[PDB]
């Protein structure tokens, strides 16, 4: 299925597990109905995979490249990485396919609690347009992944609080309309 928990309030490094033992799980009908998908596919297959080239038709992901996150490869990765686990949203969805290395995706749940997401090689998630998350590697500090969008991409990410959006209206309009 998927391996995600609701993750815990404690400060200190945010690529450890924050994951209290004992604690509660999360599935994927809740994070379907917090408009998120999930996808389990062949990363060695990814330069010519139909699954993907489905998913993309169906989605009109029109756009794509590829990030290699870690010290050596991408510049100014000690900023990078700080801005990612910063809590922000966007105006568009959000679309990673972890193709080698692994990494967790928080994101806040309908009473605005922090569920954190285990993604690995093989893991494709689409956060909505509007949704708080952040983003941060984990201990082994290596994570590629599949960008994926609608059209030319625009990464803005505007931090919290950003709640005067129309996206991020949408999106809370669409919790309260299940
Ligand atoms: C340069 S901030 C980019 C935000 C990105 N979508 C993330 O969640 O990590
Ligand atoms: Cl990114
Ligand atoms: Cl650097
Ligand atoms: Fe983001």
């Known amino acids: 299925m998927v391996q995600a928990w609701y993750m ?11 994951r209290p033992d004992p604690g509660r799980p999360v599935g994927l009908e809740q994070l379907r109905r917090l408009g998120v998908l999930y ?11 139909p699954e993907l080239e489905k998913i993309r038709r169906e989605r009109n992901y029109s756009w794509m490249d590829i990030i290699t996150i870690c010290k050596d490869k991408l510049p100014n ?5 700080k801005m990612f686990y910063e809590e922000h949203l966007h105006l568009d969805d959000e679309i990673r396919y972890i ?6 995706f928080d994101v806040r749940d309908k009473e605005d ?26 201990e082994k500090n290596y994570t590629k992944a599949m960008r994926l969008f609608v059209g030319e991409p625009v990464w803005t990410a505007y931090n919290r609080p950003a709640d005067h959006f129309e996206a991020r209206g949408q999106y809370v309009k669409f919790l309260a309309q299940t």
């Open 8 to 18: 815990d309030d404690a400060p200190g490094d945010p690529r450890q597990p924050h």
């Open 39 to 49: 996808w389990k596919l062949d990363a060695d297959k990814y330069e010519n995979d």
């Open 77 to 81: 990765y000690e900023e990078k990485i």
């Open 99 to 104: 193709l080698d290395g692994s990494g967790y």
């Open 113 to 138: 609690q922090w569920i954190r997401i285990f993604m690995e090689k093989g893991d494709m998630v689409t956060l909505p347009a509007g949704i708080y998350h952040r983003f941060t590697v984990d």
